[PDB]
Design an enzyme around this catalytic site. Sequence first.
Site, PDB file in Angstrom:
ATOM      1  N   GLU A  94      -0.668  -0.264  16.703  1.00 51.56           N
ATOM      2  CA  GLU A  94      -1.595   0.779  16.244  1.00 51.56           C
ATOM      3  C   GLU A  94      -2.648   1.110  17.306  1.00 51.56           C
ATOM      4  O   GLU A  94      -2.956   2.279  17.540  1.00 51.56           O
ATOM      5  CB  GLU A  94      -2.253   0.421  14.910  1.00 51.56           C
ATOM      6  CG  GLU A  94      -3.062   1.594  14.362  1.00 51.56           C
ATOM      7  CD  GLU A  94      -3.900   1.236  13.148  1.00 51.56           C
ATOM      8  OE1 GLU A  94      -5.058   1.665  13.131  1.00 51.56           O
ATOM      9  OE2 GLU A  94      -3.429   0.529  12.242  1.00 51.56           O
TER      10      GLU A  94
ATOM     11  N   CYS B 136       0.841  -1.186   0.000  1.00 48.98           N
ATOM     12  CA  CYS B 136       0.000   0.000   0.000  1.00 48.98           C
ATOM     13  C   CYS B 136       0.890   1.256   0.000  1.00 48.98           C
ATOM     14  O   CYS B 136       2.124   1.158   0.080  1.00 48.98           O
ATOM     15  CB  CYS B 136      -0.870  -0.005   1.257  1.00 48.98           C
ATOM     16  SG  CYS B 136       0.144   0.025   2.771  1.00 48.98           S
TER      17      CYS B 136
END
Length: 309
Positions: free
Chosen positions: A126, A12
């Site tokens: 995260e 990505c």
Amino acid sequence: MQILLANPRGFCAGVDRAISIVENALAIYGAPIYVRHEVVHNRYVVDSLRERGAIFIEQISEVPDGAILIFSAHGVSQAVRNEAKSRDLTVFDATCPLVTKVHMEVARASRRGEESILIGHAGHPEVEGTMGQYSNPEGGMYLVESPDDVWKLTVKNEEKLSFMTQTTLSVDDTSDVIDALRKRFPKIVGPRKDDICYATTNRQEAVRALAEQAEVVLVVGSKNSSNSNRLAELAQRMGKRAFLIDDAKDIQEEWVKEVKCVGVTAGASAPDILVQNVVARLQQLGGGEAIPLEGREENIVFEVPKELR
Ligand SMILES: O=P(O)(O)OP(=O)(O)OCc1ccncc1
Ligand code: F3S
């Protein structure tokens, strides 16, 4: 045996940026470059960068004074950031812009003393980084992983409540969690859908299409890659045997024996060379030319900071 390739798959924009940040830092300043957490959750990438003089640490107290520190793509808490900021360290932030976006909303809610709920998986860096943007003790920051977690959450003021998500979740599971949040907390405010990123959405859509054709699905990605794990799980839930593999050596012949159609995809942190080697191995095991499936075009790129060109 027919080999099908999912599309989109692999890198990505955030991963490509984050790896470039570390590579460029090494080129500019030389070894060592410190990196807080694995820059991305991929063994091949991490081992490579270590061989080039990146040192991966979990705590800032492992980094000497004067050093260059890079935060990983997953992001970091305000506490980590301030702990780096107070020290003599030169910091570059490889946090994906799409994670930063979520951070800013948590920060906003904290400033207001209004409670926030994050959907995500406990212990993931995260989640630790996003929860770590909330500091107002008058409000609150709550983690939920499932509808059952929603069903037992109590908050102080459900009239002033918002939610956010981890970027790499199952689109389908997250939808169920959100439906639960809205039944329990009718005034809860969120984005239109979730904070699952374009790349996660797109790879999940792609692996669904793949698994409709393939009997067996190989997902290139490391064990600690959240998004990679979701691809494997999605395929498995569709009744296909799916394996998460770091590289071609991991493929066991029994997995594809007498299989007429094998599918391959890759998580967002897995370099294309790993897929090419997987294909080469499937060909040794009787596969033919790899056929790319038709897929949604991705066009987003995130540039490195100008300081690291
Ligand atoms: O899927 P993961 O969160 O475990 O991270 P990854 O496999 O390193 O993929 C890159 C990334 C980074 C930051 N947020 C989303 C994805
Ligand atoms: S959050 Fe960013 S690091 Fe990749 S998987 Fe999504 S674009």
